[PDB]
Amino acid sequence: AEAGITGTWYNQLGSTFIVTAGADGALTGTYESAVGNAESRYVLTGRYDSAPATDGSGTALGWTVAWKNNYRNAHSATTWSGQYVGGAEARINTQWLLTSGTTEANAWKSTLVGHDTFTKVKP
Amino acid sequence: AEAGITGTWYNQLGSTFIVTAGADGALTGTYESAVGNAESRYVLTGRYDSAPATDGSGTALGWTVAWKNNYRNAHSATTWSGQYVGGAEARINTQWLLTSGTTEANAWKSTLVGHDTFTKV
Amino acid sequence: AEAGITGTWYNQLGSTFIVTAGADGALTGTYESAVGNAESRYVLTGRYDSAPATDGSGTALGWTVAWKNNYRNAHSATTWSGQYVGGAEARINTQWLLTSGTTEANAWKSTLVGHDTFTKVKP
Amino acid sequence: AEAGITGTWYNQLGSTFIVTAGADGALTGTYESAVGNAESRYVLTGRYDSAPATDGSGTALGWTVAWKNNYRNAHSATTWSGQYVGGAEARINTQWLLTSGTTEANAWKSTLVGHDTFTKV
Numbered sequence: 001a002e003a004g005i006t007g008t009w010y011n012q013l014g015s016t017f018i019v020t021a022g023a024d025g026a027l028t029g030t031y032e033s034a035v036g037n038a039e040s041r042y043v044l045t046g047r048y049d050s051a052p053a054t055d056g057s058g059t060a061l062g063w064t065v066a067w068k069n070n071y072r073n074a075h076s077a078t079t080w081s082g083q084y085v086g087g088a089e090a091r092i093n094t095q096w097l098l099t100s101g102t103t104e105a106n107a108w109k110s111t112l113v114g115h116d117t118f119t120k121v122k123p
Numbered sequence: 124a125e126a127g128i129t130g131t132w133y134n135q136l137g138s139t140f141i142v143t144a145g146a147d148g149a150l151t152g153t154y155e156s157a158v159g160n161a162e163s164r165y166v167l168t169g170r171y172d173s174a175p176a177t178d179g180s181g182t183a184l185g186w187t188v189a190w191k192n193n194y195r196n197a198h199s200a201t202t203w204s205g206q207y208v209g210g211a212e213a214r215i216n217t218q219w220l221l222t223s224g225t226t227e228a229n230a231w232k233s234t235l236v237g238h239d240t241f242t243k244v
Numbered sequence: 245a246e247a248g249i250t251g252t253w254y255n256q257l258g259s260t261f262i263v264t265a266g267a268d269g270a271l272t273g274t275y276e277s278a279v280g281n282a283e284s285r286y287v288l289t290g291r292y293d294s295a296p297a298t299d300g301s302g303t304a305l306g307w308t309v310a311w312k313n314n315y316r317n318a319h320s321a322t323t324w325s326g327q328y329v330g331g332a333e334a335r336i337n338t339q340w341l342l343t344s345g346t347t348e349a350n351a352w353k354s355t356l357v358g359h360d361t362f363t364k365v366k367p
Numbered sequence: 368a369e370a371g372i373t374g375t376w377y378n379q380l381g382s383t384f385i386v387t388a389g390a391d392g393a394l395t396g397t398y399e400s401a402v403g404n405a406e407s408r409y410v411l412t413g414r415y416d417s418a419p420a421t422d423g424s425g426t427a428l429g430w431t432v433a434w435k436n437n438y439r440n441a442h443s444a445t446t447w448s449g450q451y452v453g454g455a456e457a458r459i460n461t462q463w464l465l466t467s468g469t470t471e472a473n474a475w476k477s478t479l480v481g482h483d484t485f486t487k488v
C-alpha cells in the first residue's frame with residue numbers, strides 16, 4: 001500500500017530511510033547509513049507491488065542506493081529486496097547486496113550480503 | 124564506460140534489459156524476463172556510480188523490478204546489484220534477490236538468489 | 245573454541261542443531277528443522293576456525309545438511325555460514341543458502357537465501 | 368551422476384577441488400584457492416543427496432572450508448551450496464558465502480557472496 005510504506009523508517013544499525021510510494025509502484029526518497037564510507041543523504045529509487053494480495057501477505061518491494069552524493073563517493077551500490085508487513089508495528093524485512101566496483105581480479109570479492117529490518121516511525 | 128550502460132542488454136536466460144543511464148546516476152528502462160510468472164515488459168528504476176574510480180574498476184549499479192504490469196502481478200520484486208565493465212566486450216555482472224510477498228509462515232523461504240551476466244549480444 | 249560451539253542450539257524457527265567441535269576444526273552433529281519437507285534428524289558436517297583471534301571477534305564456521313535421511317528425501321542441501329560469538333549468551337549468527345536439485349530449465353530458481361540466529365542451551 | 372562427483376574439479380578462478388563422494392551422502396576432500404589469503408590445501412567436508420530424483424534434475428550438495436591450515440589462518444569460512452549435473456560435460460554450479468570472524472562493529476560487513484562453476488577441465 002503506498003500510504004503504509006511512505007514515511008520514515010530506521011533499522012537496527014541506526015540508518016534512516018525516508019520513502020514515498022507513488023501510485024504507479026514507484027519508491028523515491030533518501031537513505032542515511034550509520035555505517036560505511038558514507039556521509040549525509042543518498043538518493044534511493046525502487047519499486048513495490050502496488051497491488052499485494054488480501055492474504056496477511058507482505059508487499060514485495062526493492063530499492064537501490066549508489067553510494068555517491070556531493071560529499072562522498074564510495075564507488076558502490078546496494079539493493080535491498082524484502083517485503084513490507086503493515087499493522088500496528090509495521091516492518092520491512094530485507095536482505096541486501098552491496099557491490100563495490102573492482103578490478104576484474106578482485107571481482108570474486110565484490111559483493112557483501114546482509115539483512116536489515118526497518119521499523120517505521122513517521123509517515 | 125558508464126554512459127555506455129545505456130542500451131539493450133541480454134542475459135544468459137534471454138531476458139532483455141533496456142536502460143538509459145542519466146548524467147546524475149539514475150537508471151531507467153524496461154525489463155522483459157524469459158523465465159517466470161512474467162509477461163511483457165515491466166518498469167525498472169535503479170542507480171549507478173556516475174563517477175567510478177583509474178583506476179581499472181567497473182561501475183557499481185543496481186536496479187529493481189516489481190513484477191506487476193498491466194498483464195501480470197506475480198507479487199514479487201527482484202533487485203540486481205553488480206558492476207558494469209566496458210571494453211570491446213562490455214558486460215554487467217550481477218547477483219539478484221527475488222522476494223515474493225509471503226505470509227509469516229513462509230517468510231523463511233521468500234527470497235531466491237541467483238546471478239546474471241548481461242552483454243549487448 | 246570447540247567447547248563453546250559444542251552443545252545444543254535452537255534458532256528462531258524452532259529448529260534444533262546438535263554439534264560437536266573436534267579439535268581438528270571439524271563439526272559433526274544432527275539438525276532437526278521445524279519447517280520444510282523435512283522430518284526427524286539429518287546429519288550435518290562442517291568446519292570452524294579452531295584458532296579465532298584475542299580480538300572480541302566471532303569464530304567463523306559453516307556446515308551442510310543434505311535433506312535426505314531414512315524417512316525423507318527432499319533433494320536439497322543447505323549450507324549455513326556465520327560466526328560464533330561466545331559469552332554468557334552465546335550466539336551463532338548465520339546466513340544460509342538452500343539449493344534444490346532441478347532441471348537445467350528451473351535452475352535460475354534453485355537457491356533460496358535466508359539467515360538464522362542460534363541461541364545455545366546445553367553443551 | 369552422483370558417484371561421478373568424485374574427482375578433481377576446477378572453477379573459473381583456477382581453484383582446485385578434489386572430492387570423494389561416499390555411498391551415504393558424505394563429501395570429503397581438499398580445496399586449494401587461486402585467490403585470497405589462502406595457501407596450499409585446506410580440508411573440506413560436505414554432504415550431497417545420495418538419492419537424487421527421473422527425473423532430469425541435478426544432485427544438490429554443499430561443503431565447507433575453514434581457511435585455516437598449517438600455513439595460514441585467514442579467520443574465515445566459506446560454504447558452497449549448488450548442484451552437480453553429469454553428462455558428457457559435468458559441472459557443479461554453486462553460490463558461496465564467505466564469512467570472516469569480525470567484532471560486532473563490523474559484523475554487518477562480514478559475509479561475501481559469489482558463485483562458482485566447476486568442471487573437470
Ligand SMILES: O=C1N[C@H]2NC(=O)N[C@H]2N1
Pocket residue numbers: 011013015016032033034035036078096097098114116475
Ligand atoms: O543501513 C545500512 N544498511 C547496510 N547495507 C549497506 O550497504 N550498508 C549498511 N547500512
Ligand SMILES: O=C1N[C@H]2NC(=O)N[C@H]2N1
Pocket residue numbers: 134136138156157158159200201219220221237239352
Ligand atoms: O532474467 C531474469 N533474471 C532472473 N531473476 C529474476 O527475478 N527473474 C529471472 N529472469
Ligand SMILES: O=C1N[C@H]2NC(=O)N[C@H]2N1
Pocket residue numbers: 231255257259260276277278279280322340341342358360
Ligand atoms: O532451521 C531451519 N533453517 C532454515 N534453512 C533451511 O534450509 N531450512 C530452514 N530450517
Ligand SMILES: O=C1N[C@H]2NC(=O)N[C@H]2N1
Pocket residue numbers: 108378380382400401402403444445463464465481483
Ligand atoms: O575458488 C574460490 N572460490 C571463492 N570463494 C572463496 O571463499 N574464495 C574464493 N576461491
